[PDB]
Design a protein around this ligand. Structure first.
Ligand SMILES: [Mg+2]
Ligand SMILES: [Mg+2]
Lengths: 437, 444
């Protein structure tokens, strides 16, 4: 409750950043009703630090703004918990400090973290990604730097397909696309046991690669409550995949299984791409909610933790640069990563091949994994043609060749034109005449 | 393909009795302009099969537009199981019944209010390994209705150096039973875990020699890495040595999640797994219209195997309304939830850990209401707010349960017990409202 001790409106934020020994947190907090804005901020600082009921260890409120409901806290770095084991930081501590008891405080109506800042000393203690989309680029025969677009999907129905049937759908998508994701719940269901399903998938992977001369990728759901179950799934898929183990990403449903889930896989399989699926993140990181944290904070936390890739959505871009760059600007804090690897944006839904380049231009690169719905593959020669067309669209974008010209020499791309006639004649008027098609 | 996922002719009594389906009850409201049954069928589609392979479809069996009630029946075959041991996993239960549906196009908020797990499935869960009975055993009480355990948290939350910390514990143990790490304490640099646990085990020996009684400690072993968790646990039990059975393993289950908890539950099945619920308000909150209820939260914890779980802190809401069915759901063998009666087949109880300002005067009324005193109390104001200090504070709570247990009027007991008599003068306001004119009785 005490202000005086935990409030130092007068602290230059730059001084704080300059002497990198404070984690900074920016929230949108609203005092209950009858309570004082700065009083309540002193109190929130209090409940997130030393409490009381020594002061070099206290959480100081350094900036307030009642109109905007903006509260900024400075957390000494000494508060964060570290491993007794290897001396590394933990995300669990960071959450606990900056978002535990403070999320159920009679006194506060709501409080949601919008951005956070970690200094070098602290930031350097985190695991960070061990691999990213470069690992995938190396499998696909692409350059390690600016490798481009990875074309993926989710096999549907989400649950229902038996083992042969699942394997088979994987094979057919593999004739035109690169990556396949297990949907969220696919695991060891009685009707489609994991051991069976995966051995068949493995074989669908060798069949597809042989028939196309191209490398294929699979993202296998290894989520469980028990870490040794997580590990037993991981080791099983890799061994089954065998010569193709480098082509397997390990999917962890991370929101519903938590940080240990993500940390098990990250530390046990540092050579395989850890695919962070955001399942049910939606109850916290949804604008309808005024509690917890935002998607930006969620995703920025994933880098530090070590996700190789994380579903980002489809600003979608501040997230993207923040995950990608060695220096990014977030809502309030700009951050340096001192060489910490990138964590690849994974986008969903999808547009057609015509729309594709709009996205590429906007983002400024095409260094993402597309997990597209079958709509993005809705194409007149089929979905094989459909996935090729997306690839052809990326390629023309990267060569800086005009779609229309690439299209005359690439059948599936030209056929996407006729597939979405009103999109074509809107985005590239000519087309009809122009393609003679 | 909507009306494939709806079947309002299904009778809830037949679903239960068939014992092949997981029933969920939500407060679901469609986005403006969309039909209730259609929206509900959407949600069932996208929570099971999807399509956007038909005998595994989730079915909407009952709906009530006016109360924003959606009840879905999920076949047990949908749920994932361990390839290592064939047991159930909460992660799958969450992914399916809640997860994916937490931002569903034509649905503006959905909150699960209750669930029913058939016998077949419920038996795949770990369930608690121990509960308050292992505490009782250690303390010397009867393993059946052994009563109230009085504890606290060491304040300040953070900042105490190893030695000072260990002496604060020592001091409390002179009057009470249990001491718990505050949620954030671990291995900060000012108070290394290894040093502080060495010194705390020591104050435990000390305090146990001087009182001639058994003392309890809950050590925070929460971490991101399982192996770090496992190492914290092994270090703490080892260090306590002879007193290893007196240690509860504290795991912040909300922020590290389900695998943290399962790590502690299976690596150390013999020690009481203290599930502190921190962060949880974000979703649990009455205020939030998404995720799930605290009742739901609590019920999940039993199945995962939490030994005890934090509840009813209250806050300053002195209406009333809900948060009652939680106590019985957590401890009975058969309990009634807001929608479903649940049978637990002999699966061990999970003990309520209550907090806050439970002073010795309100204690009796609390117990009369719950029907028993079988909980762990992590007192703050009840202890700390006594004119004689926390130790007298602690003794007065022990005293209050003793009066209650023996069916002795509090005033009578207060007359014979100094600490209880002085609780009255500590909380004057409490005494006016519950013990009309105690003044005379006690003599000023
Ligand atoms: Mg999905
Ligand atoms: Mg607390």
């Amino acid at each position: 409750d005490q202000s005086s001790r935990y409030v130092n409106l007068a602290l230059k934020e730059e001084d704080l950043i300059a002497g990198g020994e404070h984690v900074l947190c920016a929230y949108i907090m609203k005092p209950k009703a009858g309570y004082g804005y700065v009083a309540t901020a002193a109190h929130f600082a209090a409940e997130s630090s030393t409490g009381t009921n020594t002061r070099g260890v206290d959480a100081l409120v350094y900036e307030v703004d009642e109109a905007r409901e903006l509260t900024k806290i400075a957390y000494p770095v000494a508060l964060f918990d570290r491993n007794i084991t290897d001396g590394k930081a933990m995300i669990a501590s960071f959450l606990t400090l900056t978002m535990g008891n403070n999320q159920g405080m009679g006194d506060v109506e709501y409080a949601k973290m919008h951005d956070f800042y970690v200094p070098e000393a602290y930031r350097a203690l985190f695991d960070g990604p061990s691999v990213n989309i470069s690992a995938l680029w190396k499998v696909l025969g692409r350059p390690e730097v600016d490798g481009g677009l990875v074309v993926g999907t989710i096999i549907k129905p989400k649950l229902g397909l038996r083992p042969k049937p699942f394997a088979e759908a994987c094979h057919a998508f593999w004739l035109g696309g690169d990556f396949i994701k297990n949907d969220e719940p696919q695991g060891n269901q009685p009707f489609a046991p994991l051991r069976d399903t995966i051995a068949l998938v493995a074989d669908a992977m060798r069949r597809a690669q042989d028939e196309t001369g191209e490398a294929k990728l699979f993202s296998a759901n290894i989520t469980a409550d028990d870490p040794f179950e997580i590990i037993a799934r991981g080791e099983y898929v890799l061994e089954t995949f065998g010569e193709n183990a480098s082509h397997v990403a390990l999917l962890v449903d991370g929101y519903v299984a938590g940080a240990a889930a993500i940390t098990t896989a990250r530390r046990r399989f540092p050579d395989n791409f850890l695919h962070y699926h955001r399942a049910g993140h939606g109850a916290v990181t949804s604008p309808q909610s005024k509690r917890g944290y935002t998607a930006f904070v969620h995703c920025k936390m994933a880098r530090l933790q070590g996700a190789s890739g994380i579903h980002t959505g489809t600003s979608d871009r501040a997230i993207a640069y923040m995950l990608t760059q060695d220096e990014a600007q977030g809502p309030f804090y700009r951050q340096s990563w001192g060489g910490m690897k990138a964590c690849t944006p994974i986008i969903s839904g999808g547009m057609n091949a015509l729309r594709m380049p709009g996205f590429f231009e906007n983002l400024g690169n095409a260094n993402v994994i597309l997990t597209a719905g079958g709509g993005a593959f809705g194409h007149i020669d089929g979905p094989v043609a459909g996935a090729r067309s997306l690839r052809q669209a990326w390629q023309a974008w990267r060569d800086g060749v005009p779609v229309l010209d690439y299209a005359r020499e690439h059948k599936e791309l030209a056929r996407a034109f006729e597939s979405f006639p009103g999109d074509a004649d809107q985005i590239y008027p000519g087309w009809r005449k122009a393609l003679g098609v």
